[model samples]
Target: SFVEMVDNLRGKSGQGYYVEMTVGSPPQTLNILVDTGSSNFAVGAAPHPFLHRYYQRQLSSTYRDLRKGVYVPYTQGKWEGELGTDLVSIPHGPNVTVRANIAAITESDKFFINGSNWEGILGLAYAEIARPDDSLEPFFDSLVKQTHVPNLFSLQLCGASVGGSMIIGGIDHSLYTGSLWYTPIRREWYYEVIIVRVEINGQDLKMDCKEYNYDKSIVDSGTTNLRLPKKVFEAAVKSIKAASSTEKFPDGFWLGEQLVCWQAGTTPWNIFPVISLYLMGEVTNQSFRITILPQQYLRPVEDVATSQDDCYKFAISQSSTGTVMGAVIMEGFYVVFDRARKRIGFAVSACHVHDEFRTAAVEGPFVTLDMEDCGYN
Candidate 1:
């Protein structure tokens, strides 16, 4: 019924989104990545070459070592850590402390990249995916239990032009437009969903619904792009090239290898297509489509653009695992993880709208393409 708003969820440019949190008795502060794809609260415990700073376990009198080994491997990077517990608190947010599970990474690679501004990952997922084992209780689960807050949370990951907001327990009506559209959670391990169909600039992908979610489909804030299955990704790319005024594109540009550039004053958005997803909703036999404009998928290479040319890399990539609705799409909407009701909700975020420009769109309630759960796979 009540919500605790957090102001520390900031954008770390091209890398990830993280929140400032404190741990242990003395309350050492650390900036940690907020990930919905994974289910462990991990921190860079020891000194790593990539990290600016790390958590010193000994400095925390309240830190308790559970003596269990925790290993979590991600799409590109992995980490090995020791299991522990500490008094964790979110700074400048809810004034509550919860004894939360901590995975203190002693060693890692690729997990902490060069441009990464955060030292750890705060996985806001269910306990079903909690590692070391599923027996581990997720941090949010603990937070809701101890704090007596509602079992819902919402995120608004604003782009570099603005800051971010994370509200625990309930969603803020002011952050989104219209009403929050609800989609049933097909699987709890990830914020999994069923994507019934996909369109490139309004042209259908032509593949069956099952192929869209062949492996899995998830909504993850930690991921940087709008990822799709190999086939889906390639077709989308080809269609984008076809739809653009400049039909010529280096193959590497679509492969995410080379940078695409325009003169300093040109806007490339008008040339690109909006990749649309027909997503399954909470109701039986119904679907809605969410569209992400070129504004979301064509992120400018900021540091490089700081020189003279305006360059960009493809923000949508090929996902071997499944379809991922990452920051590219999530940034356009205020996402609600309504665990209490087993539904994920999306509403247009207020921050992305500037005067006459609209960055996101959600349209829906069409009849089902197929009765079977496409994401239930």
Candidate 2:
């Protein structure tokens, strides 16, 4: 938590979460998705069918286009935009307005969510992954450097029913408690991690530690579910099925194609299993275990009318890429992206106070750890 600083407020929509950013002279505000998986603070520069609004450069005399092209690819969505620079400010984030890079998205495909909310996707990862090129300083890096705030940011992503906020330059001790456990970054573009092991309901899956990081492992707030590498996914589901009650749910439920709802005002902790990821931490032989109760992964279907029953959607999905600790796990804890130290920290979130079941706790220093390169490349 060694960093100089300021904090910002972020809000959630149907799925993705975001912070408010006002761009250019005469200032136009936009809800930009607080995406940490990728870098390039892009704004909707043109009219798109899905986006509610786009940033109009013509209105802002201070805005200047670099005339260079930028194409940002994603596993879920992709967009092509032009590089530009303009005065930018986060409404409640940092007090100073600084010139920052902006990929004013002029065109797109699946990038925008139809009629949901956010006008842009603000990348929060490192500049190495920045589209067009890494030489272009990302908005966060620019802000931190000019403002004199250390290069650190923390996330507090609350699920559909809860509220969340963001701390820009340093960790907010009040939002979390107890000793924080952190894992070194194995690699990047994604704040990659080395996963030592995985457990469900306190029972280890017992697979080769290498299998967990077969593709990659990351803590991505943009992704809605707890994505597991194909092998890890199978093992996790098998363990969960074994641990769960006798509920005849359809196969589509686990695949995310179907939803299972219980009575309204009902809690379904008994129906699901708790999931934990033991990340490779400071020492070679010691690791930290971050657990998530059903509350974090059992998401509600807000689109469905809860006239009687509240529909639930499973947040754990199969990922061929690797194990992604997305919003499903992030919502349960306070995750600190310590870029300065090259490690990520996890602590019990203040929001976890409402979760009775046992999800968001950093319990570790567990036995002998795996000495494999896996966990990630």
Candidate 3:
């Protein structure tokens, strides 16, 4: 029997999920971002105003200084800190406590820690990506091993305004509908899954492995948009242009320099092409498909004046390497990371609003919300 802990995640500028966690014996609560693309439990790098409180090692009785210096660099920023171990806890109805290693940041550059809503980031990627030493066990892995919980966790991420939930130890059957369609993890490093084929507007691009294999893609909840390699990005853009009947802007619409767009009317769904990814199912030894509609990828730009004449931007971006299935494509789906089974599960989310699910302290293995409490009437 496994216990489930549910915590609401704050959506951060459409970038990632921010969660609250407590550390040490007395427990000092820290608001941090939840990232599935990196592995490094770090805190206390932001400015004083944005980050109200920081983890003071001297205040905790259970703190142990490992005396190891750690440096981690991400696409957005970099962090340098001291590695140590302490009692980490999360609010799971009641608080569930476990001892885990963490990086106490002393220095950071180009990071959003300056005046962001959250203080730091809690990485959920595999141990392989951890800095200073990849051998160090991750916080979640330690929690599962020490607390005797199932080696599984799930994420329910809502849109920009409405917050979502993160379930640890087990899945919340009530949060998602239909049987979860799962695919084996090709690599344990970064929640990497096998992407056998990619189709645009119902036409297969016929990507061969010799030149560039479309066999793998990372399901990164941390990233804001889908990132594809040069070859794949070019092919996708070409396919989209060929299939659509919209006018292309001479100065191509720029989306943060990675994604470019053209002028499309208010509703891009009617004109934009649908992109589908075919994934290999390890259990059935077959294939299952997931579709990314135009509404999900072709986002609309707000125009203050004449709001009718707005452009729809592409959510998919071009990366130097690797294909990342980011938050844009993952918004409406309930994702489960099953470490024990070495697979990832996906299904449609049940709750669409931020306040639909309420937090509570529980004494049972699992608990479901009442229809009235969920505001479903």
Candidate 4:
């Protein structure tokens, strides 16, 4: 990720920049697209007909009234409409509040697009939302059961403008410099991963053939790629076809174009197979850069052809679980979710303003804010 080697720049419109928030009490903004590999935080409902009418159901009375009760379910099935619960507020510090459940989706024609916001989607993560038949209850588990801090929350994404601190429950004692780099719990807290080994320049390559483990690896900062396991996905295409470089795309073999090609600088696998996540011991985060790696998923072709070495098997099978440690491995870094001492930490870019905090521009699946330039919803 030399920033993708600059064939274009100036922010290159991977798009991200929208900010405005005030939930309940004479204030309603909600633009959303700040997904940390998604947990749940939904918006956009007003007789749903979206194409970009801004879903403004007459400017927020907390919409959703599709009928008497209000029910919601996804994976296909369940919709009753009538759910409304606001009070979202995400200014970071100074009166930050939470609790969301704002649904209306016009008349529900099913919506899920990436660019060009239509207004819907604002997840922030951490779920379990009670279960009274579990229909709809995610807004950070209803604000950790209405602010009980179910296990202590924290985030400090950064990119400048001094923006560092999404702190839920704990953090912001002046952003961080010491402590907090845990690694245990083995599972639970979701987004787990456990491959063990895979060397390349050092040898060790077997690819395990799929029994699927490590909770199926989904540490999503909002996903980018590295989704292994089809025999490590054909042993990473037989080590990029043992490495030589060519074949930009023919059916896209995951984007390295099959054969494991490399051409941008000649090839031979110039080192890129670390693939080790053993964990449960020894802990490792290494901390590489390239914006960490998530400038909005790439793959945009029309006449583009391919480069960046044709994108290593579509960026290492796009990392796994809910799609690999998103935000391109959580850009820069400062990922910690302690849960009363359970432990989880990854600190490297603690202060370049938190290394441009890219949990996909922050919206809410565990809390994302910065309003709307996070336009990836």
Mind sharing the TM-score for model 1?
A: 0.94
The superposed Cα distance between candidate 2 and the true structure at residue 212, in angstroms, equals 0.9
Residue-level lDDT of model 1, residues 1-377, one tens digit each, is: 22346455776556878888999989988888889988999999998888898889999999999989999988878999999999999875667899999999999977897746788999998888889778999999999989977898899888743357788778888788877788888878989888888887778888877878869899998898888898888788778878884656788888877887777767656678777788887677888878788877887676453566777888899988999999878885889999999999988887663223544677878788464747534
Per-candidate Cα lDDT values, in order, are 0.82, 0.79, 0.68, 0.42
RMSD list, candidates in order = 2.1, 2.5, 9.7, 19.3
Q: 1-377, model 3: which lDDT tens digit per residue?
A: 21344446775444467777888978888877878888888887334444677888888899999988898888668878888999987664224688888888887776655545666778888899888768888888787779867788888877644467788777888777766777777678888876666788779887652112343468888788888777888888778776764755332542333333334433434556668776666543355666676656654454444544644556778776578888777766788999899999877667432221221111111122221121111
Which portions of model 1 miss their true places by more than 4 Å? 1-6, 245-247, 303-306, 353-359
Number of clashes in model 1?
A: 0
Model 3 regions more than 4 Å off: 1-7, 45-52, 92-94, 113-115, 209-216, 250-255, 258-265, 283-285, 299-313, 351-377
Question: Please, what is the TM-score per model?
Answer: 0.94, 0.93, 0.82, 0.30
Candidates 2 and 4 compared: the better one by TM-score is 2
Model 1 worst lDDT run, 10 consecutive residues: 351-360
Q: Which should have the higher TM-score, number 1 or number 3?
A: 1
Best by TM-score: 1
- Poorest 10 consecutive residues of model 2 by lDDT? 1-10
Which pairs of residues collide in model 1? none
lDDT of 2 by residue, 233-284 (tens): 8878877776664777899988888988877777557667767778887887
Which regions in candidate 2 have their CA more than 4 angstroms from the true location?
1-14, 160-162, 303-306, 353-359
Off by over 4 Å in 4: 1-34, 37-59, 62-85, 88-119, 123-142, 152-218, 227-240, 243-276, 280-338, 342-377
